[PDB]
Amino acid sequence: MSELEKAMVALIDVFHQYSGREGDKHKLKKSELKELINNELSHFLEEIKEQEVVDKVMETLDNDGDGECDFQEFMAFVAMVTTACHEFFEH
Amino acid sequence: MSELEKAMVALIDVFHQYSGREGDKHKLKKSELKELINNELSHFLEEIKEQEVVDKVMETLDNDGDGECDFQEFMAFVAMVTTACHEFFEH
Amino acid sequence: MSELEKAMVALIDVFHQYSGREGDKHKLKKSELKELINNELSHFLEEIKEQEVVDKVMETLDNDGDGECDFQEFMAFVAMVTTACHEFFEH
Amino acid sequence: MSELEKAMVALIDVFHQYSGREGDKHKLKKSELKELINNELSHFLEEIKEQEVVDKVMETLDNDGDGECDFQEFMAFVAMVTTACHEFFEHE
Amino acid sequence: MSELEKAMVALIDVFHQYSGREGDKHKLKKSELKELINNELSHFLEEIKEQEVVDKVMETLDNDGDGECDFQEFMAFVAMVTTACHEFFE
């Protein structure tokens, strides 16, 4: 598989890894999203330490309004974060 | 780097491997997109062998209608392809 | 170690994670096999929830007729599931 | 994905890596199998140098006569090496 | 660095990792040796569950009688274990 293909499997893996911890095994609840952001995105995002911050992140990602982040919402989240960090190269 | 962050860097790297070939070095033109798909997504997608199919993929991805795929749009494509793969893994 | 070499070791390690829980530490009994499948093959296989399903899985895997799955029989099951997954990535 | 599920995908991945280089993209020809063994099994197996050795491994693995190793045949190879490794280790 | 030189540094590093956990930072006391064996040699050695067993392992390794395993003593243990592994090719 190419490196791009392996990158896509890794996105699915990390999602499974956190979404399967608690409750709904196919979505991230606020707590799981907090742990994903803090443990897996520490070079791209500041550590989330206040519930207002977890709440706004989740409010932003949660387009179906169920209070959780499903896989499609997580892919959009990754797209936003990666797009943002790639703007570094856009000058 | 986490495996998530490595995936994110891979996505940026592969995008540029193809985007910088011609014209705007931060967008994929149709020829660059065709090559990316054919060389980097050979296990997940059918090889593109017809200009018509190339036009249709770009028409689908090109959300801002500038005729090219920028990195935001490329992320949306990756998310679509990832999604297809993720379906295989929910049982 | 290469990714292949680590993968071979991971197959050994998972077999023993389960085989050593109960009874003979070198074989998977039904309950161990059910737990391995349910916990470690959840994205590749439907969860096993009924004794009758467990029984038929063991019956296919248990070639030598001792009522359990030994390492070699487990390697055959791994080759079966892997071949199934490999049929996916054919393009 | 579990460690087991990752290990299965890593088997598919390495197969692809070598099978797609030359000729039939869905099979390892002798040179492709040689490379895979020398680059990816370079801690479990001795480097294959002599052609005769390459020839013999392929004859071991090639069950359908076509002179190449397909994925199914490669999985039987993987089981052979994993078993050898299993016998190398302690389990008590 | 060759694969041999890198192996050597890895041996130094694992000894460091465990020798620094309690007491004398340069030696493995019995608890530290038990943990290294159980955490880092799980594919080559039986897990140690009994104190008799780790006392016996240390008695064997402990050539200067201080009741701990220093690095030179650790290298000897590594030599024994690797030589035993190698018996697989005998």
Add this chain to the structure above:
Amino acid sequence: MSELEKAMVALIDVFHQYSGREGDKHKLKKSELKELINNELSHFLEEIKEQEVVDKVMETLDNDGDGECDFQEFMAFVAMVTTACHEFFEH
């Protein structure tokens, strides 16, 4: 496999890569030992350029008097060289 276990296998691997050159493929003769030192211990040890230096190393290592270095004897050489290197990082 742990880094320590990886190390142990590397040690077996290099020994065989040299021992297998000539004569007994399970032992290092003087020429093979010289080559191992010069090519694999180039950063820990001064290059051997003198027959007397070779002779001396082998006399030190060879404990069963066959005039060669088997694996067990090589492990003793490894212990010795590593130990000397460790003390160098010592507080």
Add this chain to the structure above:
Amino acid sequence: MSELEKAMVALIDVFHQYSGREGDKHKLKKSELKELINNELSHFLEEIKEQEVVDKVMETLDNDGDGECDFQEFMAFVAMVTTACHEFFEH
């Protein structure tokens, strides 16, 4: 990621481990640089315990005159130390 790539990220990570303790989270004040040296270079460098050694090291590393060590400046320190280590292995 290659070993080189992972090593570069490890440099960023240890820097931040100590840089974020106090004050500017993006620079090392002398107390922080001291602790970094004392805790993460314990096998390469003798412990610093005198004001003047810290003062001396910081004056060497400080090129923009803020009395702190930013990440670029830290990289000159890393270069110095590593070059020093490389010289021990060249013999």
Add this chain to the structure above:
Amino acid sequence: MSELEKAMVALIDVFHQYSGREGDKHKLKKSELKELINNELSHFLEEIKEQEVVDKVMETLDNDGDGECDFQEFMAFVAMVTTACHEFFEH
């Protein structure tokens, strides 16, 4: 060893692997430097396909003018790349 110590040994190791191939075994000639960048900086850097690219990189790094990069000069390059990576993660 700490993560920082191992990172430092990794930097010296990668230098040894590439500097050893051709000519002066203690320095990187331009072909060696191209190989290192293409093989070891492949996730962070663009592939060098145009010879004028290593030519200009060497131009900057060579400060004793043997037209090659020694370890010292190599560390400056590692600073430059690592610093860019830091700024990239700095958003």
